[model samples]
Structure formats: C-alpha cells, structure tokens
Target: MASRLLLNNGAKMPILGLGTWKSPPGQVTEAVKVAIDVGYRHIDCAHVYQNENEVGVAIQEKLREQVVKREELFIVSKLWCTYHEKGLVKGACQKTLSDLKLDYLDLYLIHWPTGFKPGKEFFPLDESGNVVPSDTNILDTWAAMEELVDEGLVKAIGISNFNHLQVEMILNKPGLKYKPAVNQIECHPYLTQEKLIQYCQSKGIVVTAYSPLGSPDRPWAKPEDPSLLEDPRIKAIAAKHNKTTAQVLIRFPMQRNLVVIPKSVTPERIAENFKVFDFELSSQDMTTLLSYNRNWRVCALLSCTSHKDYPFHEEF
Candidate 1:
C-alpha cells in the first residue's frame, strides 16, 4: 500500500499519486490503468490538464471492473485560472465534474490566485495576457467553494500556486471558512522549497509537491536547463539504494513528508513511480541532496510575473 498523510481537515491522502499534468491525451488513460493495478490509490487531475474525460474513462473502467471503489480512490481536481471569478467558481467545478463523469470530487483547488475574464480566457487567452492587476479577494472564491463542501459536491477546498502570504490571506479572512487542506506547488529536489514547506506544515496544511522530478519535459525549458534526474549525486544515491534516479527524486519529498505527484505515461515509468516505499534516504544523503537547491523552478509561468498576484515574487 502507498503511504499517506493526514490533512488539516482530518482526511487521509496518499503521499504518492499519478499526476495528469502534460500527460498526452493518447497515453493518459492507459497510464492511469497501469497505475491503479500497481497500487496507486491517488490520481491527481486538473481541469487545465485538458484530459479529464480520458482520465475519467480509465477511472470508470476500474470501478466497473471491481478493481477499485470510488471510496478508496482519492481524486483531486483543480479549478483553473479563468474560473477564479467568484461567480464562475461553481460552474467551473460543475464543468469539470461533467467532463470527469463524476457526481463529486474528493478535493477541488483554486488553480491560481490570479483571476481572468471568464469565457474569453477559458479555452484560449487574450493575445495580450490573462492575469489580474490585484489578486482577487480569494476569500470570495473560497466562500463559493465552501458551498461546494456544504452541497456535497466536493469534500475539501484548497489553493494552488499560492505563496506564504497568499495562504495567510486565506487564513486571515474576516469570516474565513475552511482552512485550505493542501497547497500544491512546483516542488522538486532542485527547488526543495524549504521555507514554504516548513511554513505550510506548521499551519497543518499538507504540501503536495508537483513536478517532483523537476518537470524536464516542460515546454518552456531550454536546452541549457539543468536536469535534476541526471544529476550525479541523485544517481549515485539511487545506485546505493538500488533504485532509479527518478525514484530518488520522488523519495526526496516523501522524506520531508510532502505528498508527491510525478507525471509519466509509459507503463514502465508509471509503475516505477509507485515503488518508493521500500527505501528511505539517509540523514547525510538527505542533507547532501538538499544542497542541489537551485531555486530552479520548472513552472515559473514567467510570462505572468508582472501580474499583481504573481506568487513567486516572495522569498519562498
């Protein structure tokens, strides 16, 4: 069985999940199937992933085959930037529910702090950009999301791509409702995010580390971008443990007790991402790997840095 973490809301989430980010439409369904058979109880999806219907089909088949139950699977979906408008929150989640063919979602997140004009930016963005001058009073959006929990359409509501002060913004709302259950971010060995991880954990909010392998396939990457997986230190650590370099990167976050979602479509790679439980990194090795911190973010979303709510502006 995969290891798990307890959220502030008292819900248990698998520490390792199959990330649907950048998963090609043609390969995601099978990748999800192989993952379930290999004992992955959690499958993370984002409406922005643009393949929820495909993921939904694979999940439907698993349920129909009696291989897994809706109750046993932890399905997480994120609300996209265009849906950040307070009024559009419910409709956005409903659309995701319809695409996934589900009655409800286990967890739903505000995809980003920045809001965008509803329809024009939903599928395709304005030629200029799609970022807010000021971060929307996300408390308003949270109010709508809280209603989802009350309406029984979503179990938990959280935030993503938000930094420490942004999280505090939610926590300090005048009439704040649910505390965010998790803060999913672009985290990996090269960008260990020590300050943010320690802060969120202290507040009882779990941190889900996305791109735990440094997202080598990210579109914006240049030929000169550093390769976290091929780094000699991580490879050497993997050799010492008789594991793959990717496994070393995956396990690195688990050592920090952060939930990790590594994306891949190859059946072999899908299965490889799930076998992190048998090994643990040494204190010395953990410290050494921590040294690789390049503040090397893979999903910098640099184009939007000028936006008022650009989250990476803080020291963390």
Candidate 2:
C-alpha cells in the first residue's frame, strides 16, 4: 500500500493516487475497483472527465464491502471552467458529491485558472464547431469556492494549472479563510516545475504532480509528441535500477515528497504503477534525473485559443 501525507487541515491523503482522466466511461468502474484493490486510496476526479458516476459506483461498492472506509480514502474532485460562476461553484461541487455518493470530498480544486461557457468543451466552438470566444474570470470563481468550504460542502480547496501570479492573487485576497491546501499540476522529470512547486511550498500549499509518466496516453496528446518513458536518460536510469520506466517516473516525484497521480486501466499496469514504494532511487540517480529536466509540458491548455489568458503562448 502507498503511504499517506497529512494536509494542512490534518487530513491524511495518499501520496500515490489513481488519476481518472481519459479513463473511458465503460471501463472506469472496473478500473476503480482494481485500483482500490491494488492499494490506491487517493483518486483524482473531475466533472470534465464525465466518468464520476461510474467511478462513484465502484467506490460505493468498495465502501459497502468494507474494502476501504471514507476516512481511509482521499478522493479529490475539481470544478470545471464552465462552473466557475459564483452561483455555480457550490452547486457544482454538490453535484460531484451527489454523483460520487459521498458527503464531502477530501480535496477540491479549481481545475484551471481560466473559465469558459457552461456547456462548452475544453476547446470553444462556433456554430460550425470551430473555436469561438468566451468570457470567464478565475478570481470571481475562486470567491465562490471559498464559500463552499465555509458552508461545509468541501473539506479543502485549491488550484490546478495555476502560475505564481494567479495563486498570489488568491493568497492576497482578503477574507480568504483557507489557503490552498494543494495545487495539482503537470509535473514530471521533463516538466520539473521547480519554481512553481517551490512557490506553492513556500505558501504551505501541497503540490500534487499529475502526468508523472509524462502522460503519454493523455487523450489529446499527439503520437508525435516525445515520450518521457522512452527518453534515453530515464531509460538508462531505469536499466541501472532494474525497474521499468514507469516505476522511475513515479519514484522521481515520490522522492521529492510530491503527491503523484498516474492513470492506468490495465490490471498489470495498475499493479505496476503502485509498486514505486518498494524501492528507493539513490541520490546520484536522483541528481541525474533532476539534470534531465527539460521543462517539457504536455498539457499546455493552448488548444483553446478563445481565452485571453490561454497559458500556452503566454510568457511566464
């Protein structure tokens, strides 16, 4: 079983969780069951994934069978850009809780700093299915999120895919009861995100690293995109340790004390992904992995060109 980390509120969260993004709806339930059996107590979920209902059913079954209790698991969900409206924030989280059949979430996050129209997909579309414009502000939405925690709907609130300036805006906001507990973002050897991680840590915000294996199977990622698993540096290190590339990818973040969420539906891969805690990477190997950081970011969110603050092309 994976180890747990204590959040700012004294909540115990698993260091290694199951990421449900890109998990097909049909297989999500079985995937959740398998993941739980293999010792995944943290589950990263979001409304955008559209599989919360299926994942929820599996969780309910686990609870019913005493596989794990509510307190033993750390379930996370995010507010989609479309539901950032002040009136929609709590309702959206409630809907997620309702779908998952849980009373409260271990962690809730503003999935992204940007916002979009309610029914629109990640990429906006015109009448002809081409990209179009939309109006949404992240700060206005964050205000509503604060309300959710105050009302006892969500246990913790945080941000995802946000840069320093954006997080600073929230931290500096008056009447902010809870500082962000965690910031889930794309983190891997390729995209080390050292600056952002340090910034979040400095503010007492725990960082959760998604795409720990470089997210090669990310739904929208192109086949032509570079694979971190196959990178010579990672491969060579894995060979030395007699471990698979995936194991190294997960260990890199675990060694840094960052929560990692690697997604997989295959039974063998699910078990394989959970095996990181059994071995430790030496300091020399760790330094070598750090040196391999190329700032590779796979989920740029630039495909949606309508948002004025689309991060892909913006200079950080």
Candidate 3:
C-alpha cells in the first residue's frame, strides 16, 4: 500500500494504480482480482479498452466478498475522443458507469484533446480504412465534463494525453468548474517529459506517468523500438539498488512525486510494480535516468496524421 496524494479538491488519489490498457478481455477479470488481492486499490480503465464489464465484475466480486470497500478504491476511466460531443459526454460517462457497475468514478479524464464524431472510433474511416473528417471540438466537450462534476456524477475531472497548450485551453475556458486534476502521459526513462511535468506542476496539475516501464509489453513496439528495460543506463541504476530495470523505471517518476501506472497482466509483475513504494532512488540515480530522456513517445496515434491537429511530424 502506497501513500496517497491529495488532489486540489482534497480527494486522495493513490500514487500508484494498476493500468488496464491492452489487457486481453479473457484475462482482465482475473488480473483485476489478483491485483486487488495483492493490494492494488487504484485502477485505471478506459471505455476504448472494451473490458469495463469484466473489470466491473471483478470489483463487484471483491466487494461482495468483503475484499475491499468502495471508498477504499480509486477507479479512473477516460472519456474517449469519439464521445466528445456535448450531447454525448454524459451519456458516454453514464454508459461507462453502468458497465463498470459504479455510481460515480473517482477520477474521469478526457482521453485525448482531439475530438471525433459520436460513436465513431478515434480513427474515422473512408471506404478503405482511409481517414475521414469529423466535427467535434474538445472545449465544447470539456464544458460538458464540467457539468458532470457539477451534477455529482464524477468526483473529479481531468485530461489525458493533452499537451501544455491544450491543457491551458481547458483551464482558460470561462466558467470552468474544475482545473484538470491530472494529466496522464506516456513517460519513461527514454521519454522523461521533464519540461511537461514541470509545466503541469506549475499549474497545480498532477502528472501521471503511463508506460512507466517503457511499455515493454506493447505488441507493435518491440525489437525495432528501443527497449527501456534493457537500456544500459537503467541497468546500471537498477544494479546499484539491487532492483530490476522495471522497478527503477517505476520508482523514477514516483520519486519525483508523479503518479505512475505500470500495466502488467501477470500476477507476479502486478505485485512487483506495486512494491516500488518500499524503496527510494538516490539523487545520483535520478540524475542518471533523467539523462536518458530522448523525448520518446510510444503511443502516438499515427492514424490521426490526416487531421489538421495531428501534433507529431513524420520525423517523430
């Protein structure tokens, strides 16, 4: 059990949470149960994962069996880009709550700054999987999100995968009820995102580091992609602490007071990542890992290139 951080609104969020991204539907429920049994009180889920029902089942079973109380868990879900319409936002969140068997989410996020048509996937299509134009604006959708918190359907509202400029857009919106509580981003030794983290902190927004282990399990990002676990710098730091490269990666961001979610379906790894709170990385170790930053971003939505707002260039 790790200590929690107090959000600006005074909500206590667990510093470490189990990430449910990319967990296979067949295995997610069991993984959730195992993670909870092993002391994970926070879970990060998304509607796009399409496993909310399974995760909901696991949470229900745990409660039914007195494994944990509802108040003891911090469940987070993100609103996908497709559901960014002002009309669709509440319905989307309600549907997610229904699927997850929760009356309200502890933390809800706008999954991406970009917007797409209601019911359409992030990558809208033409006749042959080509791209098509859509008409939804993120600010309009965020306005609806502010209403969700006002209506008491969610405890907190936040953003994910949003840049500093995009976050400022939401923060500067008139009559905004809530500043983003957290900004979830792809962070690791290779892509430390120091400037982005500092910017978020300056704005009083908590930054959550996803893919903290550098997404080693990512199916498409292997062999050709640089492996963070095998990096010489990480290995050197891990050796000093008698820890694994994965542990060092998890500790790095957490040591900086950032939230970290390292996804692992394996029970052993799930428990292993949770154990990171027990140790501390020295200042020298932190500096060494920070030096490895090369601005690596693993989860770029390449299919979004056809859109005018696609942020990354080809050289990225």
Candidate 4:
C-alpha cells in the first residue's frame, strides 16, 4: 500500500508522488496519465517547470475516463521567484490554477527564497545576464501565502529550497496565520539532508524530497558527474532485495519518515517507482546509505547566490 503522511494542518499527503520537473512538454502529459493510471495519487509540479499546461490535459483526460476523481488526487504546485511580491502572489497562484485546470491546489510552495524582479521575463536578467533581485521581504510574501489559505485557493501552503534559518524566520513571524506544511528540497542519499530534515520535522513541517533519484536528467549535469543510481553500494543493496536502485533511493527517504517524489516519463519506470511500498530497507542498509552523504547538492542555484535569500550559504 502507498503510505501517507499527515501534515500539520491535518491533511494527509501521499508519501510518494510523481515529480514532473524536466519532464518535456509533449511527453509530460503522457507521463502524468501513466503515473495516475499506475496508482499514483500525488503529483509534484511547479510553475517554472513550464509543463503544467500539458499536465492539466492529462489530468482532464483521466478525470473524463472516470479513472480518478478530483477529490481522490493530491495536486501540488509552486510559486516561482518572479512573483514573490505580496501583490503578485495571488495572481501567480491563479495562473497556475488556470494552467492546471484545478480550482484549488492541495499544496502550494514558494519555489525559492530569492525573489527575481517582477516582469514578463521569467528570469528578468540584465544585459550582462545576471538576474535582477527583488527587495520583497520573505515574511511579507509569506503573509500573502497565508491569505491564500484563508481564501481557500490552496488547501495548504509550504516552502521549497529553504534552509532552517529561513524556515525559522517564517515560523517566528508576528501574527503568522498558517505555518508552512511542507518544505520541498533536493534530497537523496548523496545529499542526505539529515539535520535539516530533523529540524523541520521537530517543528511539525514535513520535508519532501524533490530529486530522490539524483536528477540524472537535469540539463546542467555533466557526463563526468557522480551518479547516485550507478553507485556500486546501492546496486549491491538493490541486488540483495531484488529491487532497482531507483527503488532503493526512493525507499531511503520513506524509511526516514520523509515524503519522496521521483520523476520519470517512461511508463515502466513510473510504475516501478510506485512499487517502493512493497519492500523494506533494513537499519544496516539505512546506515550504509546515510554514510554516503557528502553534503552534496545537485540543484544548487549558484547564479542566485547574489540574492539575499540564497539558502545554501548557511550550513544547515
């Protein structure tokens, strides 16, 4: 059975979800369709992914076929950095809702802590190609996010790509309404966010793993880069359990009581990823995986380092 974790708001989110980042436009619709048909109830998406329109089509088709009902599925999306201003939050959320063909998102996240200059350009880079930063404070943006929950536009609001201090700042915000329900971050065995995850959970914020399989398909990945899936240690464990490396990686987070969303456009792999519930990783296996942590990050937004809210600068 696919397990579910209870958010602080009393909403139950599927511990496993189908991630849609890097899933190409034409293929993403099919990926979402196949993922739902394979019994996936949670789907992780973001406005910056640029494939929500396609993802909407797949969801509509599945609903029309009577394969799944709106109330039965959990759809998640994020607000991009370009729309961090308090005035822009509602409109940005509305756009995502329109593109996804959903009235209300189950969970909506702030994509990153850094805010880009608001404009028609998503990046809004200067002539030299540096991203222009917005001075909007995160607390102000978070207040707007809380208003979304009050208006019922999103059932829950959360944060993504945030370090502990950033999360604490929001947690300590004066007159705070809704605390972030989840913090989605790039996580895997190689970049095991042990301390950060522990901190968030202690504060009742569920941590969701974004790149559970190490994001080998990321555009910036180099040929010589280390591969988490190809690691011999993981392979040996997979062999011992007769499961795939992806399955082990997915299970690693679940065993730690964390939510994990692994992305794949292939029907077979999509189906395979959901099968993680059938196996168990032993305590010894967990230790070996934890030992592989090198404080490595695959989705480091290096270009945004100049922004005041860049999260990786602090050691979590």
Ranking by TM-score: 4, 1, 3, 2
Clashing pairs in 2: none
From the highest lDDT down, the ranking of the candidates is 4, 1, 3, 2
lDDT of 1: 0.86
Give residue 151's error in model 4 in angstroms.
Answer: 0.7
Tens digit of lDDT per residue, candidate 3, span 200-297?
99898988999888777776775678988888867887898888888888888888889888888898888888788677898888888888888777
Better of 1 and 4 by lDDT: 4
Question: Candidate 2, residues 1-316: lDDT per residue as tens digits?
Answer: 3498778877778899999999998998999999999889989999889999999999999999999998888899999877777887888899899999999998899988777776646655666553444366766777788788888888888889888877888888777677888989898877788888888888878899998988777667776778888888889889988899999999898888899999987888998999888788999988887887777787877546546646544333
TM-score of each: 0.95, 0.93, 0.94, 0.98
Q: How far is candidate 4 from the true structure (C-alpha RMSD, Å)?
A: 1.1
Clashes by residue pair, model 1: none
* lDDT by residue (tens digit), candidate 4, 1-316: 4489999999999998999999999999999999999999999999999999999999999999999999889999999999999999999999999999999999999999999999888777776656799988789999999999999999999999999999999999999998999999988888998899999999999999988888998888898888999999999999999999999999999998899999999999999999987889999999999999998888888777777898998998
**What is the Å distance of residue 277 in model 4 from its true position?**
1.1
**Segments in model 3 whose C-alpha atoms lie over 4 Å from true places:** 120-122, 127-130, 311-316
Q: Give candidate 2 misplaced runs (Cα > 4 Å).
A: 120-122, 126-135, 312-316
TM-score of 3: 0.94
Superposition error at 266 for model 1 (Å): 0.5
Best-performing candidate as measured by lDDT: 4
Q: What CA root-mean-square deviation does each model show from the true structure? A: 1.8, 2.2, 2.2, 1.1
Model 3 accuracy (lDDT, Cα): 0.84
